[PDB]
Amino acid sequence: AYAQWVIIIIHNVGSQDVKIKNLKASWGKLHADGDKDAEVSASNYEGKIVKPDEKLQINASGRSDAAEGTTGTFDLVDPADGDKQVRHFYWDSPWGSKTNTWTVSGSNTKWMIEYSGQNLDSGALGTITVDTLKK
């Protein structure tokens, strides 16, 4: 249901481009901002380039009566370094279960990553920001 929603903000504080790839939502659908009825396909972001001081917002929400919550994974990769994997983010706002899971994986000394604003105990995940910087 729409009562389980997540908003993720990739904020490119650093000075170098970041590419978003492998944006897949196992549970739920990706919608626009301020209108949960405007579904957007993953192709709208796959390979998208985010420049310094540019915010990339992807809003996911469980469909009406989905009862499946909102879950998926996405990858941040370096436009250089042959699309090297910068970070692998997995988010899960289950409908059935109160506990949520937002996790980070991937090894790059090249990029520093900060993230905050996610709820893990009960309810929806919330709105999440991820700061990308190319050390």
Partner 1 sequence: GDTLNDVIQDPTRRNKLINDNNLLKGIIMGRDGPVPSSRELIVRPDTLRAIINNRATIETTTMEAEFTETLMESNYNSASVKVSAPFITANSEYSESSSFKNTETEKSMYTSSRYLFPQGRIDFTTPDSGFDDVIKLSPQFTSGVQAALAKATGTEKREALQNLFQEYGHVFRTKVHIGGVLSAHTMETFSRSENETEVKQDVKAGLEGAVKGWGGGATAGHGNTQGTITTSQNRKLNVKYIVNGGDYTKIQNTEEWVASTNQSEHWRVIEVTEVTAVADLLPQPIRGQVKDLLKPLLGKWVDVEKVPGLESLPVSVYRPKGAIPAGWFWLGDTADASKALLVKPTLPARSGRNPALTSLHQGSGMTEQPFVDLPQYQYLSTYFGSFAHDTPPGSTLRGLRPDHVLPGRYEMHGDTISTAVYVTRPVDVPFPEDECFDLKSLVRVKLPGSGNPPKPRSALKKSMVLFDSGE
Note the residues at the interface with a second copy (CB under 8 A): 1-5, 7, 9, 22, 34-36, 61, 88, 98, 105, 107, 109, 112-124, 126-129
Q: Which residues touch 2 (CB under 8 Å, ≥6 apart)? A: 36, 61, 62, 63, 64
Whose Cβ is closer to partner 1: residue 46's or residue 131's? Answer: 131
CA distance 58 to 76: 13
Smallest separation, CB 129 to a second copy (Å)? 7
Distance between the two ends of the chain, CA-based, in angstroms? 40
Name the residues that contact partner 1, by CB under 8 A: 11-15, 52-53, 107, 109-110, 112, 114, 131, 133, 135
Taking the complex as a whole, the smallest distance from the CB of residue 113 to a second copy amounts, in Å, to 7
60/28 Cα distance (integer angstroms) = 7
